[PDB]
Design a protein around this ligand. Structure first.
Ligand SMILES: *[C@H](O)[C@H](C[C@@H]1CCNC1=O)NC(=O)[C@H](CC1CCCCC1)NC(=O)[C@@H](NC(=O)OCc1ccccc1)C(C)C
Ligand SMILES: *[C@H](O)[C@H](C[C@@H]1CCNC1=O)NC(=O)[C@H](CC1CCCCC1)NC(=O)[C@@H](NC(=O)OCc1ccccc1)C(C)C
Lengths: 306, 306
């Protein structure tokens, strides 16, 4: 038993990380087949970043201005193009380590693993949730741009996030692998509002089920509630409203524990209204919302990949 | 910026994971050069586990009784031996993916990444601390035995932990790669006491420095303290006593932030005596002790590996 925030094994993604340099700027790229993907702001100087005209900036660049290193194995750039906020560099060699892969645009509340990288070299791996306001709470320093987020389904890597910038609150923003930002953000160094974040209610409930499965369970109470009654409580505490779709997604955990979803909602409502009274659940003194149901099921069924 | 509990990239270790089967029991092994390492309890049946005579049980076994699969690539066993609580199977093929590696026995309070594995296939990766009572708080199900803990120093993997069992409190116990348990535990299915755990004070202080570096810093107070005065507080709250060696290890973080170590101890003393009053530090409502100083420095300097 035990429950930990767990990232996917990163080896398949490690073999795809390269370094991209344009002039003074170095960041990470993702090398799949004969294409390298990276943030288009690799082309910006420190004064372009305040209000860049990316079309005009890219026109000044030719293939030979993009330096791509894989380790110290190095790639010849034979074409370049901009797709939304990502630059796509065609290279003359297909990555021999390309895994089976897909590009996916994830939904708010879903989770993924981040392989944080500097100069094309992996530094660490951790699990993130895409917040309801389309930010992530990551760990990113200068040079981490182009680091990617991903999920694995057995042998297939689903890339879902590429890192671009940090907002004025320490939270992080980036794009899918077609270069479309999650949320309202633009790749300009200017003040940008993320807007109110909310707690991912279905994930909190999934984590309460994980706690029961692991014997942590003082919070189970006597009451039940209704989906409309609970949602009145969710509103006051900035929790996402719970829908029947969420109830259905929680079905397997409900069946495993024998605790009806609305009974668990009643326990959650009392935790929200009364706090935890200095106690903990699965080692946390806060209600955790970065585990999806489905993360919970895999962690307590032992799903593997390769 | 931002601070996350981050594991090492796992690819170098993924290429070393194999499946070991003896009779009815399947677990994970570690394949380095021409040797496969796994828990010796792979030889036990469900009624051996209550009081096993490992010498007598192993004598019944020959090389051909140990089935080792690498993926579905499969290895011929040409010798076997028991070293403390690990079994070492000599195979006829050296692992072509063997990284540069060392076996290390870590100290209590140090951290490492765990690659949780089932049937020789990686499932996930997370960071653990070896508690002062020589347990870890992991996430391990049936079949995870033989999963390993490790650190990376650029290109060298230091293996430090192999998982063996779960105690009567949900905490986990295992050995170094020479098969010596951390702590007082034996590989028998019998009630076993871990003894009182304590909080890793130098790690809490390192994490408070990480918080200041990230602008989280309401807890900085007006006071200072002495190492002897602070240790009186540490005693009452089951914190490890702070030594000058710990102060010296905190030197770089002290120099980076301009906060004297004993001033940070005074902030910690007030957090211990008064709690956090419903506030958070780096997203946690508890004092976190599973980051070493040195983890903090790498996370806020961007150290990479490959
Ligand atoms: C690429 O390695 C970095 C990664 C960030 C550095 C520290 N944490 C990070 O996640 N990205 C950048 O340095 C960004 C440069 C890009 C160039 C032009 C296109 C968009 C930005 N810049 C940032 O992340 C900066 N944040 C930012 O621009 O947010 C807008 C803002 C500015 C002022 C006040 C409010 C909001 C970051 C602060 C360095
Ligand atoms: C190998 O895959 C598993 C991993 C554990 C299963 C669930 N969580 C785990 O970490 N290891 C085992 O199943 C252990 C078998 C070994 C065979 C004989 C040598 C030592 C054990 N068994 C356990 O981990 C069990 N725990 C245990 O034996 O602790 C001692 C104990 C027993 C009763 C009351 C107090 C303490 C576990 C409970 C299945």
């Amino acid at each position: 038993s035990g429950f930990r925030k767990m990232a996917f094994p990163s080896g398949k993604v490690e073999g795809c990380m390269v370094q991209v340099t344009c002039g003074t700027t170095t960041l990470n790229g993702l090398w799949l087949d004969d294409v390298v993907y990276c943030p288009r702001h690799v082309i910006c100087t420190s004064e372009d970043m305040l209000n860049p005209n990316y079309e005009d900036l890219l026109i000044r660049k030719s293939n030979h201005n993009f330096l791509v290193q894989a380790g110290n194995v190095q790639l010849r750039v034979i074409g370049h193009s901009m797709q939304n906020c990502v630059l796509k560099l065609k290279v003359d060699t297909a990555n021999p380590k390309t895994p089976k892969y897909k590009f996916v645009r994830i939904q708010p509340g879903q989770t993924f693993s981040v392989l944080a990288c500097y100069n094309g070299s992996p530094s660490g791996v951790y699990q993130c949730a895409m917040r309801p306001n389309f930010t992530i709470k990551g760990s990113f320093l200068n040079g981490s741009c182009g680091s990617v987020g991903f999920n694995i389904d057995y042998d297939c890597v689903s890339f879902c996030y590429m890192h671009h910038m940090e907002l004025p609150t320490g939270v992080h923003a980036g794009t899918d692998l077609e270069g479309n930002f999650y949320g309202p953000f633009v790749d300009r160094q200017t003040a940008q509002a993320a807007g109110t974040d909310t707690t991912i209610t279905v994930n909190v409930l999934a984590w309460l089920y994980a706690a029961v499965i692991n014997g942590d369970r003082w919070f189970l109470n006597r009451f039940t509630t209704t989906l409309n009654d609970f949602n009145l409580v969710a509103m006051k505490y900035n929790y996402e409203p719970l829908t029947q779709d969420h109830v259905d997604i929680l079905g397997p955990l409900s069946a495993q524990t024998g605790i009806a979803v609305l009974d668990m909602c009643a326990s959650l409502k009392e935790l929200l209204q009364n706090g935890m009274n200095g106690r903990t659940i699965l080692g946390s003194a806060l209600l955790e919302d970065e585990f999806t149901p489905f993360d919970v099921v895999r962690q307590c069924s032992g799903v593997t990949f390769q």
